[PDB]
Amino acid sequence: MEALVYTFLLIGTLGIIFFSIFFREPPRIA
Amino acid sequence: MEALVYTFLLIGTLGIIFFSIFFREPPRIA
Amino acid sequence: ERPFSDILTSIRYWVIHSITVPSLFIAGWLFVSTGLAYDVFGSPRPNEYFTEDRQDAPLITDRFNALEQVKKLSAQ
Amino acid sequence: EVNILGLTATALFIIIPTSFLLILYVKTAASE
Amino acid sequence: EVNILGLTATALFIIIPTSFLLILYVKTAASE
Amino acid sequence: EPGIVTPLGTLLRPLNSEAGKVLPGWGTTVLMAVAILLFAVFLLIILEIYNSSLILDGVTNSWESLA
Amino acid sequence: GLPWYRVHTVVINDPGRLISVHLMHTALVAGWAGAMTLFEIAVFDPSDPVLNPMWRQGMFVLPFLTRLGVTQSWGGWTISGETSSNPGIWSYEGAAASHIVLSGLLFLASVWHWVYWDLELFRDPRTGKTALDLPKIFGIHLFLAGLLCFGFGAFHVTGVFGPGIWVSDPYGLTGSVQPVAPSWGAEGFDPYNPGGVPAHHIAAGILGVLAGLFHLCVRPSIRLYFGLSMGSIESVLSSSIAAVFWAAFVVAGTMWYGSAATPIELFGPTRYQWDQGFFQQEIQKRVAQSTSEGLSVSEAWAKIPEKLAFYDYIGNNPAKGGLFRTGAMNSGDGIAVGWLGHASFKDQEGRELFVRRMPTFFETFPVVLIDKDGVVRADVPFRKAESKYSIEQVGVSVTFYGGELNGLTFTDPSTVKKYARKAQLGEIFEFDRSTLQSDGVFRSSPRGWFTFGHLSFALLFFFGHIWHGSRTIFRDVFAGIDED
Amino acid sequence: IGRIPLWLVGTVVGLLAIGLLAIFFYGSYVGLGSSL
Amino acid sequence: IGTYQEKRTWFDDADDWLRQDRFVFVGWSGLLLLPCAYFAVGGWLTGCTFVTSWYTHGLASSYIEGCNFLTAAVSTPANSLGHSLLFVWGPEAQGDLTRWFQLGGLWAFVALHGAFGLIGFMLRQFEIARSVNLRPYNAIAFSAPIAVFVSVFLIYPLGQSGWFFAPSFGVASIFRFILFFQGFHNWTLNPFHMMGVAGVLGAALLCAIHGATVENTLFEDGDGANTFRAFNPTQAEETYSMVTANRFWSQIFGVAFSNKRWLHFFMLFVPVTGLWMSALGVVGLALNLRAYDFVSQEIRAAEDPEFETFYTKNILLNEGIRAWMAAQDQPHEKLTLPEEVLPRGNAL
Amino acid sequence: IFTVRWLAIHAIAVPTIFFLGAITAMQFIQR
Amino acid sequence: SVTPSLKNFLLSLVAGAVVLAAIAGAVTAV
Amino acid sequence: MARPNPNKQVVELNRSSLYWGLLLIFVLAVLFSSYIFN
Amino acid sequence: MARPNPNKQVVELNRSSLYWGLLLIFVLAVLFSSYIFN
Amino acid sequence: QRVRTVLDMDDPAKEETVKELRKDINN
Ligand code: CLA
Ligand code: CLA
Ligand code: CLA
Ligand code: CLA
Ligand SMILES: C=Cc1c(C)c2cc3nc(c4c5[nH]c(cc6nc(cc1[nH]2)C(C)=C6CC)c(C)c5C(=O)[C@@H]4C(=O)OC)[C@@H](CCC(=O)OC/C=C(\C)CCC[C@H](C)CCC[C@H](C)CCCC(C)C)[C@@H]3C
Ligand SMILES: CC(C)=CCC/C(C)=C/CC/C(C)=C/CC/C(C)=C/CC/C(C)=C/CC/C(C)=C/CC/C(C)=C/CC/C(C)=C/CC/C(C)=C/CC1=CC(=O)C(C)=C(C)C1=O
Ligand SMILES: CCCCCCCCCCCCCCCC(=O)OC[C@H](COP(=O)(O)OC[C@@H](O)CO)OC(=O)CCCCCCCCCCCCCCC
Ligand SMILES: CC1=C(/C=C/C(C)=C/C=C/C(C)=C/C=C/C=C(C)/C=C/C=C(C)/C=C/C2=C(C)CCCC2(C)C)C(C)(C)CCC1
Ligand SMILES: CC1=C(/C=C/C(C)=C\C=C/C(C)=C/C=C/C=C(C)/C=C/C=C(C)/C=C/C2=C(C)CCCC2(C)C)C(C)(C)CCC1
Ligand SMILES: [Fe+2]
Ligand code: NA
Q1: Quick one: a GO cellular component term (chain F) (predicted)?
Q2: Structurally, how many domains does chain I consist of?
């Protein structure tokens, strides 16, 4: 496949940034 | 390669049985 | 308890088996010798393997009319 | 069709470092 | 000219279960 | 120890609120066995039709069946 | 600790995590369906629907997509060779993308159910412990299954709302997806009757709805509850595995023997179609009917379609490939590009000979050309020292009456032997072995691969059912007896 | 009970079995299946 | 059922009668095991004695025609019958017994009754293990012979043209089936069959080693020269020296068992796994999906007239098996082949 | 008696004796 | 109509029921 | 029944099981590589 | 200095570093896959 | 058309043909 790999990589990056925004470690020391 | 893979697999099996013979866990409870 | 070490030693077992086992043996012998085994199980006699029309190994070559075909190519 | 060399390279470059990082994170979170 | 599909199959069938078993053995021996 | 009380769970709670409830005696096991026997007879019917051991007037059991 | 073969026993007494791992498996299966469909679309060649169909290209999930209605893709083509209308959202790639989106949603739901496992819905109201009312769950699931079966049989396959299913010629020439009228008679139990599938799904859906209502309303007896261990999830696991491998044996049998739900145009021909001379008999009957109405036998053969002659070819035999002869059927012996014609052989004095076709069991077969009566009249010899039947001295010439070879009479015995060797394989076809760098040995059909995989899975799941039935009947001794 | 010895019964049964096996082996050289 | 009233029905009385210790156990499984096994063994001993094979295979397979125990067999039906169940009441026999014989109906009788007898026998193992409160590892082990029987006598002929290609119940018949798999299937080259061979050979290996080791580390437990009287089931001590056995096999073989559980589970595991892999291989062969060839070797031999191996010799032998066997082996296939077209070497 | 042991050993013994007599009779059948 | 194969199949069902009844009688005896 | 999961277990794999798994994997590769390469 | 190694240390990877590593790997794959497939 | 001939046409190529197997009693 060609477009499927690109779509998979893009949605993987979007899922990573979504998890980083919402399911992050709570901030400590300031 | 063709014969290299076979040689690698055979010597890997031989290394596994050598480790099983010599560097095994010591036999506990009988 | 009859552990089979007393039934076989007793003669009561053998007075009713001195005629029963030979009777069964003779029954099998006459079952073979009268041709009843051939008649019941369909095996051909040594003279009934090849008929006049065919001199080779028979083939069933039919499923839904197999009874009729085996009646045609068996011993009459 | 199908560029199986590019597929294998992309799949390995995704799988190996992601699995390595996930294993490190799991063993770090298991033992605080 | 190299049967690289068979090479990939053999290499993955060697690497993945060996790494899985080695990781299990390491995490078992680390915490007795 | 209150668990996790959730709205969909308390909606679907009655359907999981009688676990372990049984009937005394043998219940409807006779009707169950009758249904199982009828199922076995029907399965034998379709098995012998598909095996061509049960010829029917309208069934041909061949690709010409979809002619 | 836990052994590696017991790591999934942690979710036995955990309905929330059991739902989570079910959602994980469901997501993996749906994602595989989408990815496999997109791989087959990427490697599919829709240029020649007649002579290079999907089963010649190793297509596995495309026949199952086609069988229930999707025929055209987003690329503007259709597998039937017809002009593509609007595909809507439900094309091949559309169904694949829907499966991928569903897989992602199931993945998210699995993560949620893994994190939130202590739901009060899984708790017993009077004891406070965690329990599942398995008879009621079974009643609800049977009601849903009956509703789905009735809907699929009354709306989809009958075409009152859905598209229908794939129906075709008995010889696989003309076929398409269309509505099917249900057959309520004994013909509905005809396996090759397409009308028996809607009648099934309607009747079985109605019966499943009734049985689900019965299980919803009626509790089991105490004796049967203790006999089958209805409070144990291991017992329902064993029973479900039993029913599942029963169904796997059934689908493997129907795939291998052919049925209305297993079209030839989608899954390839049948080994019994090759053995029983189905396409050969139809081709010869067509030629005889044409030549009996005052037609020359060079143009009576030209009336024979390209697809039927391709069906009458041992290279399309599903029981002809190998276990490790991997890949598409085209990758074995080339992509078929044309029908050379029907090779007709004559002797020196003049009488028609017929090449004895290769049976299914044989990897190789001696090339013999026998008479109409059934006497060997020529062959390609092995010894060639005491030959009394060799073509070089018998004088067998081939004529051909088809597409590329219509009047080319070859009397050259070297070419006659080659054409006889091609004729024992069925109809002689021209192949391209350079596009895919083809092998030479015959490959297997998707029909054969499906049957092999599912029969192996069925035996494995028979063992799994036996093991789980052992584990649930013998639960106490698998736990312990405590010196008693 | 114990009127005739169990070892004598076993010996007689063994003699009959050996005779049956011997006549079975002899019948492979004569009659049907003798290849003559 | 949880100290309930449990009013007695007919099921309790029949249950108490069936699960009762007798000379032979019957149980509920005896409603299937005993008649099915008795009819299967009786049908085999009747077909090997009286039922001919002249009509179906064109041969003699009974004691009444001149066949030995190693020679007579219950032959399969003709390929023309296909996968017909061949009931005595079926459309082929049509209620005739003497012609339900000599048509291959007895083979289907023995096969179906043997399959249901195997089902009843594993059910009997389950029931006896439940009665004595023991784990059903005997049933788990017996799952592999049943898998072999199903895949060989049912799945393989169901995938082939018909019951004719199933193994006929006999000795020379099974040897025919074996040589047929050699010539037509190349069953030795199949990795699943190799796994099955390894399983059976390692199982016999484990049996011999375990018996010899246990019988050679027996302790005294007595004063006589015969150690067999030394064994007493009343004492709770082990009858053999596991420590001595472990040290002996550690210094002889390099590795040795240290757990009786693991040793006996391995003895359980090896033949069951081997027979299950062989069953999967026969399932593969049911659809002619074969490990027949090595494509690189065939291409190299085709383009190289002096390259040959034992594999090429095996393929050359398989071709001879097929060509010289099919004519007199498959009478429905009607091979009137001349002997000048068959593959024949020099002189021989 | 006529118990389960009796029925089992007789169902094994009677046809074996009958068949052994049959086979001994067939040893003297010649073409 | 009623095919002879169907009539034989129904007779076989009756015979199987008779066989099961005979087995039940034999196990209720003894 | 609380915030932690009481069903949580760990996996134990000793050196004998590691050797058996490695031997099985490598022997299966040895047996099947001749057929995969073909 | 004894039977155990005094230089024994463990590797620590928190969730922020896991997110950064996964993001770097996936962004590098996004950037370079167009050139690897070519 | 000619049911007698087509049987003798394709049976030398393949003897397991359906029409050869069925109604073989009359032959
Ligand atoms: C039961 C399910 C099933 C079935 C019937 C098929 C059937 C088919 N697949 Mg498919 N596939 C499946 C599942 C299935 N697949 C899954 C789950 C995946 C995802 C991994 C794929 C991915 C896939 C791809 C990428 C391709 C196919 C292709 C094909 C077709 C070619 C024949 C073939 O499979 O090669 C041969 C099959 C075998 C050799 C089976 C192996 C037999 C046993 C299991 C081997 C044992 C392994 C051993 C223990 C490990 C050691 C080996 C090691 C040394 C490497 C065929 C019709 C090809 C195709 O035609 O393109 C459309 C293709 O390229 N499939
Ligand atoms: C909105 C739900 C939905 C829809 C509309 C579809 C639609 C489709 N799927 Mg699918 N799928 C889904 C969900 C869905 N799926 C989910 C959730 C999964 C994960 C488990 C899958 C996994 C999946 C796979 C692996 C595949 C598909 C495939 C397909 C396509 C062909 C289906 C087919 O012909 O096979 C036929 C379907 C069946 C034979 C199911 C029969 C059900 C059995 C017989 C039930 C018997 C037991 C039952 C309980 C008895 C009830 C008793 C009775 C009295 C009531 C089709 C477009 C195929 C495809 O081509 O890929 C795209 C394919 O290979 N899907
Ligand atoms: C849907 C069917 C199903 C389900 C839900 C289960 C569930 C379970 N089984 Mg079971 N089993 C099944 C079918 C099933 N089995 C079948 C078909 C067989 C015959 C092969 C077995 C034979 C079996 C045995 C012998 C044992 C279990 C055991 C178990 C329990 C824990 C094992 C585990 O998962 O640890 C983890 C499992 C693994 C890590 C497997 C290793 C990877 C395998 C070898 C290859 C990878 C497979 C591949 C990725 C996908 C294949 C799936 C697809 C092709 C179908 C668990 C509750 C164990 C038990 O009884 O618990 C005490 C046990 O010892 N099963
Ligand atoms: C009791 C043990 C038992 C079992 C499990 C079997 C099993 C089998 N036999 Mg066998 N048989 C048995 C005893 C048994 N037999 C005995 C004692 C004899 C000597 C008479 C025979 C003689 C025999 C022959 C000659 C043949 C078989 C055959 C078969 C096979 C197929 C039978 C079939 O398809 O019909 C199906 C049977 C049933 C569906 C059972 C009927 C159950 C009915 C539906 C119960 C309904 C009763 C109902 C409650 C009545 C009340 C209603 C009313 C009040 C209105 C099968 C596996 C055939 C074979 O081997 O194939 C080659 C065959 O040729 N058997
Ligand atoms: C050729 C090999 C072979 C034979 C003959 C055989 C025979 C037997 N195995 C048994 C048991 C077992 N077999 C086991 C593991 C194995 N068994 C193996 C291989 C064999 N096992 C292997 C390789 C394994 C390792 C996996 C286990 C674990 C058990 C048992 O628990 C059991 C036992 O106690 O051992 C002593 C006995 C109980 C059978 C019975 O009463 O079934 C009842 C059903 C019957 C009698 C009907 C079936 C009839 C058959 C299937 C079809 C008809 C065949 C004709 C009657 C005879 C044809 C003979 C010709 C082919 C020569 C029986 C003597
Ligand atoms: C150049 C080179 C290297 C050339 C080599 C070329 C070549 C031909 C390579 C060989 C290829 C090769 C590996 C082939 C094998 C491939 C093959 C067929 C694989 C099968 C794989 C497989 C999984 C099969 C499934 C069936 C199965 C599970 C079989 C396993 C067989 C097996 C492991 C058997 C056990 C072996 C064995 C030695 C038993 C141990 C016995 C033992 C030491 C007991 C001792 C003992 C006994 C006691 O009683 C007590 C009390 C104690 C205390 C005690 O200790
Ligand atoms: C001069 C000396 C001659 C001997 C040298 C040759 C011996 C080779 C050693 C045997 C292999 C070691 C097995 C590792 C596996 C291993 O050692 O596991 C360890 C295991 C010991 O088990 P335990 O008693 O510790 O089990 C309890 C455990 O569960 C708890 O710790 O050994 C055994 O299972 C018993 C012996 C089986 C050995 C089976 C032989 C397998 C044959 C291997 C063939 C390889 C392929 C051919 C080569 C290409
Ligand atoms: C999250 C999300 C998403 C999604 C994503 C994705 C993309 C997913 C996926 C997925 C996928 C894409 C999947 C797939 C898969 C695959 C699989 C799951 C497979 C497999 C395997 C197997 C099972 C195998 C088996 C075997 C072997 C081992 C070898 C060969 C042979 C056999 C078959 C035996 C989105 C963004 C949309 C949105 C929402 C969210
Ligand atoms: C067929 C059939 C049937 C069935 C039947 C039955 C079930 C019966 C039987 C039977 C039987 C069951 C018979 C038998 C036989 C046997 C025999 C013939 C034997 C023998 C021989 C010999 C030679 C031996 C030797 C020896 C040994 C090895 C051991 C010890 C020692 C001695 C030396 C003694 C019926 C009618 C239902 C119907 C259907 C079909
Ligand atoms: Fe022991
Ligand atoms: Na020679």
Answers
A1: photosystem II
A2: 1
